[PDB]
Design a protein around this ligand. Structure first.
Ligand SMILES: [Zn+2]
Ligand SMILES: [Zn+2]
Ligand SMILES: [Zn+2]
Ligand SMILES: [Zn+2]
Length: 100
DNA sequence: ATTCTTGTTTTCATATCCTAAAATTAAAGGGAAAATAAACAATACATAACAAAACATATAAAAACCACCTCACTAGCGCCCCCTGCTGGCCTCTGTGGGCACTGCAA
């Protein structure tokens, strides 16, 4: 029912349309007090500051290294600890942690 | 002298009036059965008052619904070796090409 004007975005929640309009309008009100980089939400700026300094809270349960976000630890476990490999190739027997 | 009209009392007469006995007839008096009316008492209907039940409003009491925030997942593109195999000179060690001095044989 809900439709977009800038693109063919179709959702059922008005709040989803609101966020999509915020993405089109690029409301970035969160700057970094070290570099000119800016973001739209607080968690992005929090991770950016957790990269300018070493304050990595997501610790690896199987080794002693760490990362700022969860997805990086997910893929680290699928590379090094639980070799998942969901996506597989066409001809060869290849598979890896990322679609890239 | 004889004949003829006219006015007035006498007396029958015929209608009327009065009188009384019958009859009679309607009034009127009383006995009694209907009979309408009326005085009183009873029943039913209608009206008013009191009390309660039903209806409507306010309010707040959980409670339901909607929207926003947030903490992750899902894509995304570099990023960075890393390993592995071919490629294109490079160089030096065998190996291809040659000039020429040297020898053994038999004149
Ligand atoms: Zn759009
Ligand atoms: Zn910064
Ligand atoms: Zn680890
Ligand atoms: Zn393949």
């Amino acid at each position: 029912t809900f439709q977009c004007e800038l693109c063919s975005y179709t959702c059922p929640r008005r709040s989803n349309l609101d966020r999509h309009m915020k993405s089109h309008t690029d409301e970035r009100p969160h700057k970094c007090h070290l570099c000119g980089r800016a973001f739209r939400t607080v968690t992005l700026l929090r991770n950016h500051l957790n990269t300018h300094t070493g304050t990595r809270p997501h610790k690896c349960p199987d080794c002693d290294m760490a990362f700022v976000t969860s997805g990086e630890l997910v893929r680290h476990r699928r590379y090094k600890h639980t070799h998942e490999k969901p996506f597989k190739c066409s001809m060869c027997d290849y598979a890896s942690v990322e679609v890239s």
